[PDB]
Structure 1
Amino acid sequence: EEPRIGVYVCHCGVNIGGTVDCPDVTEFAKTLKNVVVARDYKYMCADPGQEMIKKDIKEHNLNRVVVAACSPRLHEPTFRRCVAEAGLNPFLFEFANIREHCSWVHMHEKEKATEKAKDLVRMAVAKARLLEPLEFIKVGVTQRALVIGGGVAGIQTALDLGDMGFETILVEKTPSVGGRMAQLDKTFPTNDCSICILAPKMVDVAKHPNVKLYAYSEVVDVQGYVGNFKVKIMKKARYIDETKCTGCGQCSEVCPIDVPNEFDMGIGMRKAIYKPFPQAVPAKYTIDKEHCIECGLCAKVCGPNAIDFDQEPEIIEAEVGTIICAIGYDAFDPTVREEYGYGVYDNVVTALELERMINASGPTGGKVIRLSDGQKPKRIAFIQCVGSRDAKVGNKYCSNVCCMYAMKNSQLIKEKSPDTEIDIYYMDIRAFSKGYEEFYERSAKQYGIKFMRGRPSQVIEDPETGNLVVRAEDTLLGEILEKEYDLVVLSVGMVPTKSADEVQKILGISRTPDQFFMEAHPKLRPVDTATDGVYLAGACQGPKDIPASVAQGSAAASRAAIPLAKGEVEVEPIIASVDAEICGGCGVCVKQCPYGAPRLVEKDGKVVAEVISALCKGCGTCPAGCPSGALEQDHFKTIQLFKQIEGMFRDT
């Protein structure tokens, strides 16, 4: 049948129309072969736009639709549903990106943007002509979810999913769940005890009938696609019998190797054999082989003889339908900001270190003290925006929680020591949510915490006393201050967790300019990722506080429960297949597929290749590498791409 194309040019208000002469693109579109209808409209995704496309498909008997608008990554599915509702196969629809790829990047070159939009429409029309109707692959959904990361976000997702009756697996890297919230002393704006409100949830998750918690474990491989993921979990060896482990802690005294306690941010000192924190769930010990010397002194003291160095990590194979990534974040390392002297001056600390110092169960026994002499500081300075809103360190974003935790900890220090003078050096106080501005008002009126508007230039240590001097301009007075302090606290920003690189490669997700994981759309889909069946929850998606993280955990559980509840999802048939009449079995394609989909086989007495459709993810590498042309990826066939290339220069 002959192509009958409908070209729709969107103005997107003035986002496109303001730069691209949309009516002119529409007139040009009509001059192309097979383009029987062409219209321009203010909002193509809106109800009148979709109804326009639909009505035209029926009235003008179109078999190809071209939408010249935003990015397919945003609305390709929207328009596929719109055309499918009118009876047109969704793979006979072609998107032409003239907004993100044209109007938004060529704002001061309108005539050239208009010319570029015409070529992109022509390139789309060129591919559209040779597109073919494909059947969306209906696949089943394994009734099981996987949550990676055991913090407040991941815990919330697994609790909601388990409460809905869905089998859920929760994988936690460290020996205990709880995340950074377990390291905090109290939480703003209520000043609630962090662990005192988090432990009940850690307990609920550990004994939930629908949640399988795998602590001290890591996801090492994820294969498959939405509804059919095959996941490999490595249950790391603690080198201590899990069942015979009482969790008393008497084998650590003998250990001669001291390791800096990660939980205490490097202030505290733990042993090779240890426990992360007192309220840890599950309550069990672990041997760190990265620092263990295998002297066996701990084994001589250990009664049960739970210690076993011949313990081997177990690889667990599990099948899940959806995956929620909630690996959280790490605190920025301020050593780079050399003028603040972190790592040089003893009394300059990060706010996360301060949290561990304030926390009752911390290394200093809940006592805020100077690391140089052990004395309690009488004067303290908080420096805001450390590692945030700073191009020199590559973090041009706001870490969201630093203004609030700085004011919070200042209140906690005042409650414990009212005579302590506290000054906060800031640019903007961001107390933007419920009770936050009130919390800010309170810090000053009730606790007498002082605020200086001015980002400090440098910190200088007095080598005689260990005291620090903060150099900064009081911008509200137009004068330079040089105030002395007993302790300087750096309000460090949030950065992606160290393992984020590994987790990205395993799930196949992307990152935003801030290096955190990328959501499908900031407003249309805040917890979904462009990768179907993979969602996000918490700080790994971007800097945010506890409630925002808990809300995302719940949101991710809802989004992740949709495929599980439906029990069936539709996946793209943009897969590779071998033309047996052309394949002479050269074997080049076999090793190119990382999923082993193409395989050599005997057919009609000779050897040919055959793609196992289910294992093909649709990359297009093997057809590109096929020297006979027998292999072709549906929707990205060489001929289709060839016509698309011709389209940039001429009509074909």
Structure 2
Amino acid sequence: EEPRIGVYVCHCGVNIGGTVDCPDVTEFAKTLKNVVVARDYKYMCADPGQEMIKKDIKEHNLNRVVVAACSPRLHEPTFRRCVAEAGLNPFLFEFANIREHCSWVHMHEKEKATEKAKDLVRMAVAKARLLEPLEFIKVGVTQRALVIGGGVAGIQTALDLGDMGFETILVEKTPSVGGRMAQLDKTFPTNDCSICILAPKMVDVAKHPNVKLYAYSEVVDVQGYVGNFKVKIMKKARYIDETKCTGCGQCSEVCPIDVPNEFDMGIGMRKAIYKPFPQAVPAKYTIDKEHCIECGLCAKVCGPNAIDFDQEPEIIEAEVGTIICAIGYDAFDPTVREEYGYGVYDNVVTALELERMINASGPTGGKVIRLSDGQKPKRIAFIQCVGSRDAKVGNKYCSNVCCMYAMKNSQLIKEKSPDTEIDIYYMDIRAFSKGYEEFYERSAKQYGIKFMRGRPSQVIEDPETGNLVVRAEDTLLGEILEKEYDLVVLSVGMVPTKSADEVQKILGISRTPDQFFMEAHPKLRPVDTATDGVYLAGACQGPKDIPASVAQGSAAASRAAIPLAKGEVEVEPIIASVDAEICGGCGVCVKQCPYGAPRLVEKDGKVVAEVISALCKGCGTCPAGCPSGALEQDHFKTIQLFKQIEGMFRDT
């Protein structure tokens, strides 16, 4: 049968129509071979727009549909479901991107944008003619979830999925769950003890009947697709018998190697054999082989003889249906902003280091003290937006929680020592959520915390006393201030965690300009990724506070529970297949596939290649490399792409 194409040009209100002359593109589409219906509408994805396509498919007997509008990455599934409801196979639908790829980037070149939209429509129509009906492949869903990261976001996802009755696996990189929330003393805007409220959730997730906790473990490999993921978890060796470990801590006293305690942000010193924090879950000790000298002094003191250097990491193979990435964030390193002197001046600290100094279980015993002489500071300055809203460090985003934690920690210091003078150097006070503006009012009115509108130019240390001078313009007075302080606290921003690169490659997910993980859509899908079966939750998706991370943890559980609850999902049949009559078994395709899908086999007395359909992810590398043309990727066949290329210059 000959193609009967329906072309739809969206205006997207004025997003497309305001730059591209949609009525003119619609008239041009009609001049193309096989195009029998062409219409322009304000919103093609809206009810009237979708009903218009369906009605035309039936009335004009269309076997191809072209929608010139937004990106397929946003509404391709939406229009595929729309055409399928009218009886048209979803793979006979073609998208032409004239918004993100045209109207939004050629706003001052309307005529050339209109001509580009015509060519993009002709290219879409050209490929559409040779598109073929493909059967959406129905695949089963393994009734099991995987959560990567055991912070407040990850713990919430696992608890929600576990409570729903779904088997869940929670992998935590460090020896304990809890994340950065465990490092905080209190939490704004209620000033609740962070661990005193998080600990119950850590306890709950550790003994949940539907949650398998793998602490001090890392996901080293993920293979497959939605509902059929095959994951490899490396249970790292603590070199201490897990079951015989009491958690008393007497073998550390003899260890001669001092390692900076990561949990205390480098202020504290721990041994090669240790426990992250006193309320850690699971409560067990670990040996760090990156700094261990293997002298065996700890083993002599240890009664249980739990210490075993011959311990080997275990690779656990698990099958899951959905994966939730909740690996969190890291604090920005302010060494780069040299004018502030971090790493040079002893009394210049970050806010996360202050959290630890303020924390009762911290290295200073909950006492805020100068690192140069151990004395309590009488005057403190907070410097906002350090590593945020700054093009010089490549971080042009708002870290979201720094205004609030600076005001919170200032209240905690005033509670401990009311005589302390505290000044906050800011640009904008961002107290945007429930009880936040009130917290800001309270900080000034009740605690006497002072606010200076002006981003400091530099910090100068007095080498004789260790005191610091903050140079900044009080923009509200139009005068330069040069106030002296005993301690300067840099309100550092949030950056993706160090392991984010490793996790990105394993899950096959993208990043946003801020370097955090990319959600499928900022409003249509805040916790989904463009990779089916992979979701996000917490700070790893972008800078945010606890309730936002907790809500995202719950949102991810719901979204990841949909495929599990359904028990069946549909996958794109854009896979490679070999034409046995043309393949002479050259073997070029075999090594090109990273999944090992194409394999040489015997057929009709001779050798030929054959693709294991289930192992093909549909990249199109082996068909591109096939020298005989026997290998072809459905939906991206060479002939289809060839006509698309012709479509840019002429009607084919």
**TM-score when scaled to structure 1?**
1.00
Which whole-Å CA distance do the structure 2 matches of 1:648 and 1:448 have between them?
Answer: 67
Which ranges of structure 1 fall in alignment gaps of 5 or more residues?
none
Deviation at 1:177, TM superposition (A): 0.2
* Distance in structure 1 (CA, Å) of the matches to 2:181 and 2:173: 15
- Does 2:44 align with 1:20? no
C-alpha deviation, 1:435, in angstroms: 0.1
Deviation of 1:622 after TM superposition, in Å, equals 0.2
1:538 CA drift (Å): 0.3
Give CA-to-partner distance per residue, 1:70-107, whole Å, 9 cap, x none.
00000000000000000000000000000000000000
Displacement of 1:322 in angstroms is: 0.1
TM-aligned CA deviation for residue 247 of structure 1: 0.4
How far residue 8 of structure 1 moved from its aligned partner, in angstroms, is 0.1
Give the Å deviation of 1:152.
0.2
Identical residues among aligned pairs (%): 100
Instruction: Report the alpha carbon displacement of residue 246 of structure 1 after superposing the two structures with TM.
Output: 0.1
Distance 1:328 1:85 in 2: 41
| Alpha-carbon distance in structure 2 between the residues aligned to 1:122 and 1:465 | 74
What is the rounded CA distance, in whole Å, between the counterparts of 1:185 and 1:60 in structure 2? 68
Instruction: Give the 5 Å matches for 1:366-385.
Output: 366-385=366-385
Q: Partner residue of 1:440?
A: 440
Whether 1:41 and 2:2 are equivalent positions in the alignment is no
Question: For 1:213 and 1:304, how far apart are their aligned partners in 2?
Answer: 24
Q: Distance in 2 between matches of 1:357 and 1:608?
A: 68
Give aligned pairs, total. 652
Q: Secondary structure at the match of 1:241?
A: coil
**Structure 1 residue 411 corresponds to structure 2 residue 414:** no
- SS of 2:642's equivalent in the other structure is helix
**Which residue does the alignment assign to 2:4?**
4
- For residues 557 and 221 of structure 1, the distance between their equivalents in structure 2, rounded to whole angstroms, comes to 22
1:560 matched to 2:560? The reply is: yes
1:615-643 residue CA offsets vs partner (Å, 9 max, x unmatched): 00000000000000000000000000000
Question: What is the deviation of 1:461?
Answer: 0.2
Deviation of residue 604 (structure 1)? 0.3
- Aligned-pair distance for 1:484? 0.1
Cα shift at 1:299: 0.1
- Specify the alignment match of 1:608 in structure 2: 608
Aligned residue for 2:339, secondary structure, equals helix
The Cα of 1:378 is off from its aligned counterpart by: 0.2
Secondary structure in structure 2 of the residue aligned to 1:469: strand
Measured after TM superposition, the shift of residue 232 of structure 1 is: 0.1
Q: C-alpha distance in 2, partners of 1:641/1:346?
A: 62
Distance 2:339 2:306 in 1: 49
For residues 159-180 of structure 1, what are the alpha-carbon distances to aligned partners after superposition, in whole Å with 9 as ceiling and x for unaligned? 0000000000000000000000
Q: Residue 256 of structure 1: CA displacement?
A: 0.2
- C-alpha distance in 2 between matches for 1:333 and 1:462: 23
State how far apart, in whole Å, the 1-side matches of 2:8 and 2:2 are.
19
Structure 2: distance between partners of 1:539 and 1:629: 47
**Distance between the aligned counterparts of 1:214 and 1:469, measured in 2?**
48
Cα shift at 1:563:
0.1
Give the Cα separation in 1 of the matches to 2:357 and 2:123: 62
Give the distance between the partners of 2:580 and 2:264, measured in 1 at CA: 63
Q: How many angstroms does 1:607 deviate by? A: 0.3
Q: CA deviation at 1:565?
A: 0.2
| Residue 326 of structure 1: how far off its partner (Å) | 0.1
Q: SS where residue 645 of structure 1 aligns? A: helix
Match of 1:168, SS state, is strand
Q: Report the 3-state secondary structure (helix = DSSP H, G, I; strand = E; otherwise coil) of the residue aligned with 1:544.
A: coil
- What CA distance in whole angstroms lies between the structure 1 residues aligned with 2:194 and 2:188? 9
| Residue-by-residue CA offset, 1:131-176 (whole Å, 9 max, x unaligned) | 0000000000000000000000000000000000000000000000
CA distance in 2, matches of 1:607, 1:132: 29
- Cα distance in 1 for partners of 2:218, 2:60 equals 56
CA distance in 1, matches of 2:47, 2:532: 26
Q: CA deviation at 1:324?
A: 0.1
Indicate the RMSD between aligned Cα atoms, in angstroms.
0.2
CA drift at 1:120: 0.2
1:219-252 C-alpha deviation (Å, 9 max, x unpaired): 0000000000000000000000000000000000
Structure 1, residues 171-220: CA drift from partner, whole Å, max 9, x if none?
A: 00000000000000000000000000000000000000000000000000
Q: Could you tell me how far 1:281 is from its partner in structure 2?
A: 0.1
The aligned runs of 1:165-184 (5 Å cut-off) are 165-184=165-184
Structure 1 residue 582, shift from structure 2 partner: 0.2
Structure 1 residue 508 displacement after superposition? 0.2
Q: Which residue of 2 aligns with 1:509?
A: 509
Residues 249-269 of structure 1 deviation map (CA, whole Å, 9 limit, x = unaligned): 000000000000000000000
- Partners of 2:492 and 2:431 in 1: CA distance: 17
Cα distance in 1 for partners of 2:284, 2:415 equals: 34
Q: In the TM superposition, what is the alpha-carbon distance from 1:449 to its structure 2 partner?
A: 0.1
Distance 1:422 1:24 in 2: 64
In the other structure, the counterpart of 1:587 is: 587
CA distance in structure 2 between the aligned counterparts of 1:61 and 1:14, rounded to whole angstroms: 31
Deviation, structure 1 residue 356: 0.4
Tell me, what secondary structure is at the counterpart of 2:541?
Answer: coil
Give me the whole-angstrom Cα distance separating, in 1, the residues matched to 2:196 and 2:122.
63
- Once residues 647 and 399 of structure 1 are traced to their aligned partners in structure 2, the CA distance between those partners, rounded to angstroms, is 46
Find the aligned partners of 1:54 and 1:305 in 2 and give their Cα distance: 73
Task: Quote the offset at 1:440 in angstroms.
Answer: 0.2
> For the residues of structure 1 that align with 2:637 and 2:140, how far apart are their CA atoms?
28
Tell me by how many angstroms 1:38 deviates.
0.2
CA offsets 1:543-595 (integer angstroms, 9 cap, x no match): 00000000000000000000000000000000000000000000000000000
Report how far residue 613 of structure 1 moved: 0.2
Deviation at 1:29, TM superposition (A): 0.3
How far did residue 56 of structure 1 move?
A: 0.2
How many angstroms apart in 2 are the aligned matches of 1:54 and 1:193?
A: 57
Q: Per-residue CA shift, 1:400-452, capped at 9, x if unaligned?
A: 00000000000000000000000000000000000000000000000000000
Q: Distance in 2 between matches of 1:66 and 1:391?
A: 41
What SS class does the counterpart of residue 13 from structure 1 fall into? coil
Aligned counterpart, 1:362 = 362
User: 1: CA distance between counterparts of 2:30 and 2:330?
Assistant: 55
Q: How far has the Cα of 1:465 moved from its partner?
A: 0.2
Q: How far has the Cα of 1:124 moved from its partner? A: 0.3
CA–CA distance in structure 1, aligned partners of residues 402 and 634 of structure 2: 50
Whole-Å Cα distance in 1 between the matches of residues 521 and 571 of structure 2?
20
Stretches of structure 2 that go unaligned for 5 or more consecutive residues are none
Measured after TM superposition, the shift of residue 289 of structure 1 is: 0.2
Q: What is the CA distance between 1:303 and its match in structure 2? A: 0.2
Give the whole-Å Cα distance in 1 for the aligned partners of 2:185 and 2:625: 57
Question: For residues 54 and 490 of structure 2, what CA distance do their matches in structure 1 show?
Answer: 58
Q: Within 2, Cα distance between the matches of 1:97 and 1:369?
A: 59
3-state SS, counterpart of residue 327 of structure 2: coil
SS in structure 1 of the partner of residue 539 of structure 2: coil
2-structure distance, mates of 1:18, 1:620: 37
Are 2:202 and 1:186 equivalent residues in the alignment? no
Distance in 2, Cα, partners of 1:377 & 1:630: 76
Residue 254 of structure 2 aligns to a residue whose secondary structure is coil
Q: Secondary structure at 1:317's aligned position in 2?
A: strand
Cα distance in 2 for partners of 1:291, 1:190 equals 40
| C-alpha deviation, 1:334, in angstroms | 0.3
Distance in 2 between residues matched to 1:136 and 1:371, nearest whole Å? 63
3-state SS of paired residue (1:588): coil
- Structure 1 residue ranges (4+ consecutive) displaced by more than 3 angstroms after TM superposition: none
1:58 to partner: Cα distance: 0.2
Output the CA distance in 1 between the equivalents of 2:481 and 2:335. 23
Q: CA deviation at 1:372?
A: 0.3
3-state secondary structure, aligned to 1:36: strand
Q: How far did 1:123 drift?
A: 0.3
Q: How far apart, in 2, do the equivalents of 1:595 and 1:65 lie?
A: 33
SS of corresponding position for 2:94: strand
Q: SS at 1:646's partner residue?
A: helix
1:334 is paired with a residue whose SS is coil
Deviation, 1:53, is 0.2
Residue by residue over 1:270-313, the C-alpha shift from the partner in whole angstroms, topping out at 9 and shown as x without a partner, is 00000000000000000000000000000000000000000000
Q: Distance in 2 between matches of 1:623 and 1:366?
A: 64
Counterparts of 1:481 and 1:252, CA distance in 2: 49
Q: Normalising by the residue count of structure 2, what TM-score does the alignment of the two structures yield? A: 1.00
For 2:357 and 2:58, the matched residues in 1 are separated by 70
SS of 1:540 mapped into structure 2: helix
Q: Give the Cα separation in 2 of the matches to 1:218 and 1:525.
A: 27
- Counterpart CA distance in 2 for 1:208 and 1:623 is 48
